[PDB]
Design a protein around this ligand. Structure first.
Ligand SMILES: [Zn+2]
Ligand SMILES: [Zn+2]
Length: 383
């Protein structure tokens, strides 16, 4: 039988957290296999746009998942907890790896992965779940274990897994916190038990592993939250999203009015017309992107006024969603298996390239994507 692919995301694991003695199992995974120095997220450096980049090889700007939170005249609103929008296929552009795996008559098993609850291009994974917070570490790890072990023509060629606990630890206390490091150990620990259980099940040697994060993490010092209204007053323009990438739409007759006040630079943020965003971000053309886009500077948030008053008064926190070239925003990429190289290190690379690699490990044709196949050929054992 051909070798299965286990794709693991650790949400918000930053590229340098592999080097702090707090990741015994993942460090050993890199000893055994391949570790990129870092992997750069796409713009914007949030969960849904990047997870869905990884699995399609497309920039957010082309796949259409352009924020965690979006509107679309035709399809309506979109946010992470809006289950009828997340599980609605018209939002999700291109073809993610599980669709491609299914269409060759092999099988995909998704614990969680953004897009995996929708029938994208008419196709849903062979195994899947609705997303629920609080699901126990052991719970998700034993179904993944099961889903690799299953045999015959109901064998799973792709198993995906997702961990939200680091990102969540990095929001409430920041990336240098005791909590963050502890959450990193807790997930690393759970990856240990997975790998160990795979061995006892005799699936370890049969299975190729890729471990990624969707972005890094930046420290937000206490009191560094302003209001999105400190950027643009309501009667001018509406804040479409808050956090760090703050979209604005002009009120029907303030189109010009809005441009003065918002555009250009300010103490803790900058704003551009969407078609003039920094060219290096490759973002601005998808229709769904609101008309002005403000990027908060590293370590500052802009929040909805009602979200401003509930904010943790005191407390060092964290965010991401910042300039995806920033070193704080760098993600992880490691990989190990029978079909991957041993001992090796790769340079820093763009997260659009992961797809071509995965498409080769899943015996599927790579759909047209924004990445370059050459970047990750050196991860392989073969040519
Ligand atoms: Zn994330
Ligand atoms: Zn997050």
């Amino acid at each position: 039988t051909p070798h299965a692919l286990l794709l693991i995301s650790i949400d918000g694991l930053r590229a340098d957290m592999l080097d702090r003695g707090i990741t015994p199992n993942l460090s050993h995974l890199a000893r055994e296999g391949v570790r990129a120095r870092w992997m750069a997220p796409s713009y914007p450096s949030l969960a849904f746009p990047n997870h869905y980049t990884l699995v399609t090889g497309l920039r957010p700007d082309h796949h259409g998942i352009v924020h965690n939170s979006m509107r679309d005249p035709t399809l309506g609103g979109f946010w992470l907890s809006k289950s009828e929008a997340v599980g609605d296929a018209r939002w999700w552009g291109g073809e993610p790896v599980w669709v491609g795996v299914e269409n060759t008559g092999q099988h995909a098993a998704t614990w969680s992965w953004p897009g995996s609850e929708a029938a994208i291009k008419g196709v849903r994974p062979s195994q899947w779940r609705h997303y629920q917070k609080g699901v126990r570490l052991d719970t998700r790890v034993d179904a993944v274990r099961g889903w690799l072990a299953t045999d015959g023509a109901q064998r799973n060629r792709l198993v995906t897994l997702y961990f939200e606990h680091v990102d969540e630890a990095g929001h409430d206390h920041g990336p240098e916190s005791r909590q963050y490091a502890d959450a990193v150990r807790a997930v690393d620990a759970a990856i240990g038990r997975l790998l160990a259980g795979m061995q006892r099940d005799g699936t370890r040697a049969r299975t190729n592993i890729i471990v990624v994060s969707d972005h890094g993490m930046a420290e937000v010092a206490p009191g560094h939250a302003i209001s999105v209204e400190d950027i643009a007053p309501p009667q001018i323009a509406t804040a479409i999203t808050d956090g760090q990438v703050i979209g604005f739409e002009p009120l029907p007759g303030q189109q010009a009015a809005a441009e003065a006040s918002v555009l250009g630079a300010h103490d803790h943020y900058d704003c551009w017309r969407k078609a003039e965003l920094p060219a290096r971000w490759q973002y601005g053309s998808h229709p769904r992107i609101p008309s002005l886009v403000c990027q908060m500077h590293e370590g500052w948030d802009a929040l909805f006024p009602d979200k401003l008053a509930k904010r943790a008064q005191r407390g060092t926190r964290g965010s991401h969603g910042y300039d995806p070239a920033l070193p704080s925003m760098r993600a992880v990429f490691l990989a190990q298996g029978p079909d991957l190289a041993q001992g090796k290190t790769l340079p820093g690379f763009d997260n659009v390239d992961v797809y071509a690699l995965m498409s080769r490990l899943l015996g599927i044709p790579a759909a047209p994507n924004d990445g370059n196949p050459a970047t990750l050929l050196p991860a392989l054992r073969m040519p």
